[PDB]
Design a binder for this molecule. Sequence first.
Ligand SMILES: Clc1ccc(-c2cc[nH]n2)cc1
Length: 511
Amino acid sequence: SRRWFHPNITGVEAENLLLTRGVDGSFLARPSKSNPGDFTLSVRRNGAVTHIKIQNTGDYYDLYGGEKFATLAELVQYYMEHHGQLKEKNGDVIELKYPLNCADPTSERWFHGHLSGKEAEKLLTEKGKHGSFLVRESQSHPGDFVLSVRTGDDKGESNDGKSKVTHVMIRCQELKYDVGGGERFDSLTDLVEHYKKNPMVETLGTVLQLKQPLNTTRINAAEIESRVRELSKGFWEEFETLQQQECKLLYSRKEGQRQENKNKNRYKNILPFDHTRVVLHDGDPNEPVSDYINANIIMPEKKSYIATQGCLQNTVNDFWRMVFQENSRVIVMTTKEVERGKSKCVKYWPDEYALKEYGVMRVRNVKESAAHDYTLRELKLSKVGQGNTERTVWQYHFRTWPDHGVPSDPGGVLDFLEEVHHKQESIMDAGPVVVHCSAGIGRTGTFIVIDILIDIIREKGVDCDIDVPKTIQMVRSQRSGMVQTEAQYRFIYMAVQHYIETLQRRLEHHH
Ligand SMILES: Clc1ccc(-c2cc[nH]n2)cc1
């Protein structure tokens, strides 16, 4: 689980907790109160506490005096299975041995805090199904909580009486929680987990199975403006609830962790999941391992994507092997080659009108066209020795994304993605759209999620269901950490709103 993240704790509270309820090797992580994208790892050692800063401006989590990570949970797993790996400024070793668990329930999907019983019934009546549940505050008994559960036959329709809502009072007595007998638990989370595993039964047989929380994030796309107004007064709480679910996604990354593959990775701990990695065939027999690239297939769940990193000097040939094998006809690039004086994506294309060989692959730059926010390069890709393999690959290079943060208006991103979409759709049997640069998780995830959400509205028009955090979770299950920050999360909502709003202007302008 992810109980070592404390969403609402001050530095002084962090110290107190470690000193009175922890030991040497106890740790926790907390967000900074004022400056978002800043986090702190607090750790006890030698009877004192040290605080280690973690920064995220949109590309990765950067731990001072340590490494860069795709998620906070991947960071914690790495140092809990690797001792003496984290070092102080002095040079000494910092051990993360014992998570210090949080009781606060405000980031759990099942917690509704403020709710009443009839409101909860109508919610579960309308949006909920067999085994749907929530926890809420009591109105008769101050300090207590209530667990509310729908059960019965989902097959049924109409108001037949084949389903019901059951309410179970939860008492809180000196910092512990219980359902009126048996075991006393240290947090609501512990209590919910236990009765999720060991469901309560009623005197007459009904089993109160806790199968899934109630969904409160799905909206009709035409109501986007109302949700955004409401989240603006919010976006942080919804984001951090989504982040709590990242512990479910620690899938294996063994092929990336192999010796033979180590210097094919921009950052050594940001790696592709095994189950979705792009596998390269037809390699050099002599090369020991010719089948690896730091890239994943992203399938929405008819257009698919490949999310990948900026090339290294020694992976440019592999990048073109991938584009050729997968039959990709469109590449999206989300960084300048250089930002803040550091290399972000190596130049892997020829100058305009020039021609270059990259291993067995040949590329001609036919023509570049400059737009306000991007440059388009018309490339032709073929295998050396075989003329009939030539196909056009169109490269869309987004150039105006800010060095830190996100753009303050989404129009340029949306016009860009609309043009990428029409090109892709013009080409019979095109393979997946390649999206990259930097570590290939932050901007890359943001552009893919926006594209997925807009495509639904392109198909089904302005009245249809969208669910931003649920989409991000499904994409995060196919590459680590897709969408990095609160500001990117907000930006996604704003882009959908802008899209909906222009689409309604067609109808206004018509009448
Ligand atoms: Cl799959 C999923 C993950 C997270 C949420 C959520 C609900 C409130 N915030 N985030 C909803 C669905």
